Amino acid sequence: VQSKIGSLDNITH
Amino acid sequence: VQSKIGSLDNITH
Amino acid sequence: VQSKIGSLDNITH
Amino acid sequence: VQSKIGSLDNITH
Amino acid sequence: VQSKIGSLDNITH
Amino acid sequence: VQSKIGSLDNITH
Amino acid sequence: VQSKIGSLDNITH
Amino acid sequence: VQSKIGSLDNITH
Amino acid sequence: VQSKIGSLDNITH
Amino acid sequence: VQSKIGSLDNITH
Amino acid sequence: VQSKIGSLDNITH
Amino acid sequence: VQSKIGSLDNITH
Amino acid sequence: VQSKIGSLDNITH
Amino acid sequence: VQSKIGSLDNITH
Amino acid sequence: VQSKIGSLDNITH
Amino acid sequence: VQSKIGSLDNITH
Amino acid sequence: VQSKIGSLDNITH
Amino acid sequence: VQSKIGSLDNITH
Amino acid sequence: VQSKIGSLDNITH
Amino acid sequence: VQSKIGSLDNITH
Amino acid sequence: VQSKIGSLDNITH
Amino acid sequence: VQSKIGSLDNITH
Amino acid sequence: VQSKIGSLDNITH
Amino acid sequence: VQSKIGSLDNITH
């Protein structure tokens, strides 16, 4: 509700 | 409800 | 509710 | 679950 | 589930 | 669960 | 009852 | 009852 | 009852 | 069995 | 069994 | 069994 | 079972 | 079981 | 069981 | 179950 | 079940 | 269960 | 209900 | 209810 | 209820 | 459900 | 559920 | 549930 997910998994390989 | 997903998996390989 | 997740796992390999 | 009730009964006299 | 009730009964006299 | 009740009965006389 | 309601599931293998 | 309701499922293999 | 309600599950393998 | 399961009842007299 | 399970009842007289 | 489980009852006289 | 009803109602006006 | 009802109501006006 | 009811109500006006 | 088993009802109005 | 089994009903108006 | 078993009801109005 | 079992097994040996 | 069991097993040996 | 067991096992040996 | 309700079973072996 | 309700069982071995 | 309610069991061995 009225929320934001910027990211969950930011993997740099 | 009135929410935003910018991204879930941002993989840089 | 009215919350934000910037990130959960930031892995640099 | 992630719901909302603005009102149920709006009675005027 | 992710629903909304704006009102149920709007009664005026 | 992550819900909200703004009001149930709004009665005026 | 024995449900998956209003949830998010992210799985990276 | 034994349902998947209002959910998101992201799977990356 | 025996449900997954309003939850987030992130799994990285 | 003879239940009101996940229902909405609105009765106005 | 003869229950009100996850329901909403609104009765106005 | 003959219970009110996770329900909302609103009664206005 | 092996019973007798002589009468039930004897009403006189 | 092996019983008798002579009468139940004897009403006179 | 092996019982008798002579009468229950004997009302006179 | 919720029955009228081997009973006698006498109603006078 | 929800039956009238071996019963006697006498109604007088 | 919730029955009227082997009982007698006499009602006079 | 209002029944009777005279016998079930009559074994002579 | 209002019943009677005369016998169940009558064994002669 | 209002019943009677004369006997259950009548064994002669 | 998977019950013996109002039944009679006689087994002789 | 998986019950003996209002039943009679006679077993002879 | 997995009960003997209002029943009769006679076992002869």
Swiss-Prot record, chains A, B, C, D, E, F, G, H, I, J, K, L, M, N, O, P, Q, R, S, T, U, V, W, X:
**Sequence positions bearing Phosphoserine:** S3, S7
Cross-link Glycyl lysine isopeptide (Lys-Gly) (interchain with G-Cter in ubiquitin) lies at K4
Q: Which residues are glycosylated?
A: K4
Subunit and partners: Interacts with MARK1, MARK2, MARK3 and MARK4. Interacts with PSMC2 through SQSTM1. Interacts with SQSTM1 when polyubiquitinated. Interacts with FKBP4. Binds to CSNK1D. Interacts with SGK1. Interacts with PIN1. Interacts with LRRK2. Interacts with LRP1, leading to endocytosis; this interaction is reduced in the presence of LRPAP1/RAP.
How are the domains described in the entry? The tau/MAP repeat binds to tubulin. Type I isoforms contain 3 repeats while type II isoforms contain 4 repeats.
Linked pathology is: In Alzheimer disease, the neuronal cytoskeleton in the brain is progressively disrupted and replaced by tangles of paired helical filaments (PHF) and straight filaments, mainly composed of hyperphosphorylated forms of TAU (PHF-TAU or AD P-TAU). O-GlcNAcylation is greatly reduced in Alzheimer disease brain cerebral cortex leading to an increase in TAU/MAPT phosphorylations. Frontotemporal dementia 1: A form of dementia characterized by pathologic finding of frontotemporal lobar degeneration, presenile dementia with behavioral changes, deterioration of cognitive capacities and loss of memory. In some cases, parkinsonian symptoms are prominent. Neuropathological changes include frontotemporal atrophy often associated with atrophy of the basal ganglia, substantia nigra, amygdala. In most cases, protein tau deposits are found in glial cells and/or neurons.
Q: Which function does this protein serve?
A: Promotes microtubule assembly and stability, and might be involved in the establishment and maintenance of neuronal polarity. The C-terminus binds axonal microtubules while the N-terminus binds neural plasma membrane components, suggesting that tau functions as a linker protein between both. Axonal polarity is predetermined by TAU/MAPT localization (in the neuronal cell) in the domain of the cell body defined by the centrosome. The short isoforms allow plasticity of the cytoskeleton whereas the longer isoforms may preferentially play a role in its stabilization.
Protein name as it appears in the record = Microtubule-associated protein tau
Q: Which organism is it from?
A: Homo sapiens
What would be the name of the gene that encodes this protein? MAPT
Please give the range of the full-length protein represented by this chain.
667 to 679 of 758
